[PDB]
Design an enzyme around this catalytic site. Structure first.
Site, PDB file in Angstrom:
ATOM      1  N   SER A 248       9.386   2.212   6.955  1.00  0.00           N
ATOM      2  CA  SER A 248       8.521   1.051   6.803  1.00  0.00           C
ATOM      3  C   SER A 248       7.752   0.927   5.521  1.00  0.00           C
ATOM      4  O   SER A 248       7.664   1.851   4.730  1.00  0.00           O
ATOM      5  CB  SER A 248       7.581   0.899   8.000  1.00  0.00           C
ATOM      6  OG  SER A 248       7.180   2.120   8.523  1.00  0.00           O
TER       7      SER A 248
ATOM      8  N   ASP B 103      -0.722   7.395  13.874  1.00  0.00           N
ATOM      9  CA  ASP B 103       0.634   7.365  14.399  1.00  0.00           C
ATOM     10  C   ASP B 103       0.832   8.383  15.525  1.00  0.00           C
ATOM     11  O   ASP B 103       1.682   9.244  15.433  1.00  0.00           O
ATOM     12  CB  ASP B 103       1.642   7.487  13.245  1.00  0.00           C
ATOM     13  CG  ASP B 103       1.598   6.258  12.296  1.00  0.00           C
ATOM     14  OD1 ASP B 103       1.294   5.138  12.789  1.00  0.00           O
ATOM     15  OD2 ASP B 103       1.878   6.392  11.062  1.00  0.00           O
TER      16      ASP B 103
ATOM     17  N   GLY C  29       9.903   6.477   5.411  1.00  0.00           N
ATOM     18  CA  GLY C  29      11.300   6.551   5.793  1.00  0.00           C
ATOM     19  C   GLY C  29      11.836   5.235   6.311  1.00  0.00           C
ATOM     20  O   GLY C  29      12.964   4.862   5.979  1.00  0.00           O
TER      21      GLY C  29
ATOM     22  N   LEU D  68       0.815  -1.215   0.000  1.00  0.00           N
ATOM     23  CA  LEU D  68       0.000   0.000   0.000  1.00  0.00           C
ATOM     24  C   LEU D  68       0.844   1.259   0.000  1.00  0.00           C
ATOM     25  O   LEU D  68       0.492   2.259  -0.621  1.00  0.00           O
ATOM     26  CB  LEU D  68      -0.916   0.016   1.232  1.00  0.00           C
ATOM     27  CG  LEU D  68      -2.016  -1.048   1.288  1.00  0.00           C
ATOM     28  CD1 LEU D  68      -2.676  -1.059   2.677  1.00  0.00           C
ATOM     29  CD2 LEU D  68      -3.056  -0.839   0.173  1.00  0.00           C
TER      30      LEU D  68
ATOM     31  N   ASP E  56       3.411  14.476  16.205  1.00  0.00           N
ATOM     32  CA  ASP E  56       3.927  14.416  14.828  1.00  0.00           C
ATOM     33  C   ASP E  56       2.845  14.614  13.804  1.00  0.00           C
ATOM     34  O   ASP E  56       2.739  13.866  12.833  1.00  0.00           O
ATOM     35  CB  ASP E  56       4.625  13.091  14.568  1.00  0.00           C
ATOM     36  CG  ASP E  56       5.659  13.166  13.416  1.00  0.00           C
ATOM     37  OD1 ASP E  56       6.158  14.265  13.106  1.00  0.00           O
ATOM     38  OD2 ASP E  56       5.993  12.105  12.851  1.00  0.00           O
TER      39      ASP E  56
ATOM     40  N   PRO F 120       1.232  16.165   7.077  1.00  0.00           N
ATOM     41  CA  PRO F 120       0.403  15.682   5.987  1.00  0.00           C
ATOM     42  C   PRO F 120       0.490  14.168   5.780  1.00  0.00           C
ATOM     43  O   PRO F 120      -0.502  13.536   5.432  1.00  0.00           O
ATOM     44  CB  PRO F 120       0.949  16.437   4.779  1.00  0.00           C
ATOM     45  CG  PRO F 120       1.451  17.742   5.365  1.00  0.00           C
ATOM     46  CD  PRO F 120       2.062  17.318   6.670  1.00  0.00           C
ATOM     47  N   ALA F 121       1.634  13.575   6.055  1.00  0.00           N
ATOM     48  CA  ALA F 121       1.767  12.151   5.864  1.00  0.00           C
ATOM     49  C   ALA F 121       0.964  11.306   6.865  1.00  0.00           C
ATOM     50  O   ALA F 121       0.766  10.095   6.623  1.00  0.00           O
ATOM     51  CB  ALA F 121       3.235  11.764   5.883  1.00  0.00           C
TER      52      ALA F 121
HETATM   53  N1  LIG Z   1      -3.657   2.547   8.079  1.00  0.00           N
HETATM   54  C1  LIG Z   1      -3.042   2.395   6.923  1.00  0.00           C
HETATM   55  N2  LIG Z   1      -3.885   2.036   5.909  1.00  0.00           N
HETATM   56  C2  LIG Z   1      -3.512   2.179   4.606  1.00  0.00           C
HETATM   57  N3  LIG Z   1      -2.297   2.726   4.270  1.00  0.00           N
HETATM   58  C3  LIG Z   1      -1.468   3.111   5.223  1.00  0.00           C
HETATM   59  C4  LIG Z   1      -1.814   2.962   6.590  1.00  0.00           C
HETATM   60  N4  LIG Z   1      -0.755   3.430   7.279  1.00  0.00           N
HETATM   61  C5  LIG Z   1       0.205   3.847   6.410  1.00  0.00           C
HETATM   62  N5  LIG Z   1      -0.239   3.648   5.121  1.00  0.00           N
HETATM   63  C6  LIG Z   1       0.481   3.908   3.868  1.00  0.00           C
HETATM   64  O1  LIG Z   1       1.855   3.633   4.050  1.00  0.00           O
HETATM   65  C7  LIG Z   1       2.666   4.787   3.834  1.00  0.00           C
HETATM   66  C8  LIG Z   1       3.835   4.751   4.799  1.00  0.00           C
HETATM   67  O2  LIG Z   1       3.399   4.879   6.131  1.00  0.00           O
HETATM   68  P1  LIG Z   1       4.219   5.852   7.129  1.00  0.00           P
HETATM   69  O3  LIG Z   1       3.719   5.791   8.519  1.00  0.00           O
HETATM   70  O4  LIG Z   1       4.267   7.241   6.490  1.00  0.00           O
HETATM   71  O5  LIG Z   1       5.661   5.151   7.016  1.00  0.00           O
HETATM   72  P2  LIG Z   1       6.864   5.279   8.061  1.00  0.00           P
HETATM   73  O6  LIG Z   1       8.140   4.888   7.421  1.00  0.00           O
HETATM   74  O7  LIG Z   1       6.536   4.473   9.307  1.00  0.00           O
HETATM   75  O8  LIG Z   1       6.705   6.845   8.417  1.00  0.00           O
HETATM   76  P3  LIG Z   1       7.848   7.984   8.550  1.00  0.00           P
HETATM   77  O9  LIG Z   1       7.185   9.059   9.469  1.00  0.00           O
HETATM   78  O10 LIG Z   1       8.243   8.350   7.101  1.00  0.00           O
HETATM   79  S1  LIG Z   1       9.267   7.453   9.324  1.00  0.00           S
HETATM   80  C9  LIG Z   1       1.712   5.974   3.966  1.00  0.00           C
HETATM   81  O11 LIG Z   1       2.024   7.082   3.150  1.00  0.00           O
HETATM   82  C10 LIG Z   1       0.421   5.352   3.462  1.00  0.00           C
HETATM   83  O12 LIG Z   1       0.403   5.306   2.055  1.00  0.00           O
END
Ligand SMILES: Nc1ncnc2c1ncn2[C@@H]1O[C@H](COP(=O)(O)OP(=O)(O)OP(O)(O)=S)[C@@H](O)[C@H]1O
Length: 271
Positions: free
Chosen positions: A23, A156, A21, A17, A138, A141-142
């Protein structure tokens, strides 16, 4: 380098999906509860890096679990044993939708009324969190998605560790609900103008600007934006937490006024 087909015997992975950074997020079927969920996992390429393994466990995996219609619920966390090594994950509510970061990137600024609706709903998520003793810390927009049925979902919450940080976070002062207000103001700024309030060649440069420099009023950065909207956005972005909205609910109330074309209570801003 792949992510396994399964995580425990419970979660059967489907489509990827998203990724960030640290995950990658996959659509998965929970075989036990017959539920489509989102599983966030340490990225397969970073998975051998001890510094990322640690960050993932200390940050991503620590997302607070809250039950609200505008908050992405957290269901489970764990660690799969992988031929490569232990692979940490967090299981959460699946959102069929797109982050605000992606929307701004692909579509430009939102019409003003849509932007107010989206951010007003985020205020409800934040109010609930604050009422339950959790500061998001935190807002960006993301961390806000809009579903295919147009519901706002905030995710998050409550993790420790520049475009969206409050001055107090830049200074290492106390962080509180007003810090979330400020950071949500940055998001609002960005969905209305297509640009965040402050940009820099580095995060220290952006942090500096949050502490020291006045944001350009939104109506100066972009057409179709009223002075009432400048007033609301510029209040959320006040340097001194005492001059901001004191609660997410106070911010939402001014958003709802502007949505209905009533004057906000925020101080007038002239240009
Ligand atoms: N609940 C969820 N349902 C559907 N898509 C999700 C969900 N959570 C995250 N995503 C998707 O996965 C992408 C990455 O999740 P993030 O939380 O931004 O990744 P991350 O690496 O943990 O975050 P950072 O803040 O970059 S370190 C998001 O931009 C969404 O496209």
């Amino acid at each position: 380098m792949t992510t396994p087909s399964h995580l425990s015997d419970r979660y059967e992975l489907g489509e990827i999906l998203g990724f960030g950074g640290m995950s990658e997020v996959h659509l998965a079927r929970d075989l036990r509860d017959h539920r489509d969920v989102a599983v966030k996992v340490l990225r397969a390429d970073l998975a051998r890096d001890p510094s990322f393994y640690l960050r993932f466990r200390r940050e991503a995996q620590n997302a607070a679990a809250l039950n609200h219609p505008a908050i992405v619920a957290v269901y489970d966390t764990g660690e799969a044993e992988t031929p490569a090594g232990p692979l940490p994950y967090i299981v959460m509510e699946y959102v069929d939708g797109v982050t605000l970061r992606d929307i701004v990137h692909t579509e430009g600024p939102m019409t003003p009324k849509r932007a107010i609706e989206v951010i007003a709903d985020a205020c409800q998520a934040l109010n609930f969190s604050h009422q339950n003793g959790i500061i998001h810390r935190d807002v960006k927009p993301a961390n806000i998605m809009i579903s295919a049925t147009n519901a706002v979902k905030v995710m998050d919450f409550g993790i420790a560790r520049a475009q969206y940080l409050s001055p107090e976070q830049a200074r290492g002062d106390s962080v509180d609900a007003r810090s979330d207000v400020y950071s949500l103001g940055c998001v609002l700024y960005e969905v209305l103008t297509g640009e965040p309030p402050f940009t820099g060649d580095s995060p220290v440069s952006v942090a500096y600007q949050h502490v020291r420099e006045d944001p350009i009023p939104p109506s100066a950065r972009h057409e179709g934006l009223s002075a009432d909207l400048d007033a609301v956005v510029l209040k959320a972005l006040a340097k001194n937490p005492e001059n901001r909205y004191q609660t997410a609910a106070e911010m939402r109330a001014d958003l709802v006024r502007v949505h209905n074309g009533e004057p906000p209570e925020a101080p007038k801003v002239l240009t």
